[PDB]
Symmetry: C3
Subunit: 127 residues, 3 copies
Amino acid sequence: KKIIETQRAPGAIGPYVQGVDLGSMVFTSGQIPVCPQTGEIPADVQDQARLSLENVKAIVVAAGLSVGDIIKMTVFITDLNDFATINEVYKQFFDEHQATYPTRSCVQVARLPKDVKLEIEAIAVRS
Amino acid sequence: KKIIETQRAPGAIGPYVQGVDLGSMVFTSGQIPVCPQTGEIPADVQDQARLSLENVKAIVVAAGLSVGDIIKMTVFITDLNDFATINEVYKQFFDEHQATYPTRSCVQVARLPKDVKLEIEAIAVRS
Amino acid sequence: KKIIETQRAPGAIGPYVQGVDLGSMVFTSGQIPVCPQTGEIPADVQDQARLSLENVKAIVVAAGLSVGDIIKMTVFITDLNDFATINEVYKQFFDEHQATYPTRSCVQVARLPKDVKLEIEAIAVRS
């Protein structure tokens, strides 16, 4: 097992790491829509959805994998009224990478770190 | 990295697949109590709990595994008043398949897709 | 698979086992701050955070692993205003065991079993 560290996702500040590479599989921490260059959160849910996905991608790529290697995500959201919009961004993200859609669970939680609108964790496999 | 597709669980609404088979282990998407034939959601939570579990089972069996190969579930619910009823159905389901109980997490979320009362994801292993 | 059972973590109430050992990987059930000897839930969030973590430790140890083998934690909580206290206890727990921090997701849910303030599920790997 090996820690994943990348400047292309928000840095871990505290008692977790961005990702862990087990060889056969990679786990990410839950990624929130904080911009790694600014430490700020875009207000618009479309922009948050894209940025959470970009943060996940940065970690998977730092491990030497690709978006197409992601096989499970969990998408925690604060408002299911945002779901159709989040889904559209998510679908286009995978389509743009010519990637098969992963398995997914999606639930509306009460609140997320920094009052973001979503948090996404991923599991990828090394094929 | 084989996709699992079965008509005995609801077809994928959004950008996800029902299950993925990695060879050593199978992940399902979070299953909601939607009838795969009719698209209907049963009104009583006893019926929703059974249907969510049948939907999980369909995907696991589609991968060539059994209920007894399920090693972890997460049960997301909207009302802890439903918990005893859900636990009863869940226990009977595993017992009917002569299956040891998996590990489990259970939490009450704010809301679920299609306003269902529960969503269940699973991980199964192939020995 | 092998079931993990220890009297050092609370006994299963519902239809679940404490842990499952797959050889390369161990999964725990979501651990809540119930005292394994008395059944009591401590009132204070610092004490709940410590107890949940000890319950995770008991199961990972029963599998022949240790805290430093944990690679992912999901921390479901009822109030993000508790997070600073929870995080300090969590950091101290890993630091006391000279353990690299795992990946993590943290979200605020509506409610948890037995009205606890947090529930922590772990995944560990056998190196």
